[PDB]
Amino acid sequence: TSPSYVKFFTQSNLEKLPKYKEKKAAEEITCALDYLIPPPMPKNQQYRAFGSIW
Amino acid sequence: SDQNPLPTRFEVELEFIQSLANIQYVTYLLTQQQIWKSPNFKNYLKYLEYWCNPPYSQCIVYPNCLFILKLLNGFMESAIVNEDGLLEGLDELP
Structure with missing residues (x-):
């Protein structure tokens, strides 16, 4: 199956997103709209790819 | 023994976007009935293009x-x- 987060991706939340993004400019999840915003990059660069697999 | 904590959202989305690299799996998805009722799944996959950039x-x-x-x-x-x-466009395939 797909990640649980899909459930938040409704056209309603999508519409409210632009405004939410501004207010915020004024793990840390506090509401559903936070899931429509990509997670932050970890500090450990072990998350950087060692190579490519085709 | 082999065990570690459950994954993060970052970790989960990275694991997920990457399994779309396997065509059989991507196929299994487009031939789901439920996920295309709502724009949820479609909207989610567009959100995931955040990986396409540094x-x-x-x-x-x-x-x-x-x-x-x-x-x-x-x-x-x-x-x-x-x-x-x-x-619609896929009904014909095996």
Whole structure:
């Protein structure tokens, strides 16, 4: 199956997103709209790819 | 023994976007009935294009997934959805 987060991706939340993004400019999840915003990059660069697999 | 904590959202989305690198799996998805009723899944896959850019893209080990993701997305816009969930343009295939 797909990640649980899909459930938040409704056209309603999508519409409210632009405004939410501004207010915020004024793990840390506090509401559903936070899931429509990509997670932050970890500090450990072990998350950087060692190579490519085709 | 082998055990570690459950994954993060970052960790989960990275694991997920990358499995789209395998065509059999991507196929299993487009031939789901439920996921195409609601724009949820379609909207989610467009959100995931955040990996297509740095610093995210530097984390991808399976590069085919980013191309397939982009195609899959463009397909969706023009894609005509049946009334059940069946994606119209694919009904014919095996």
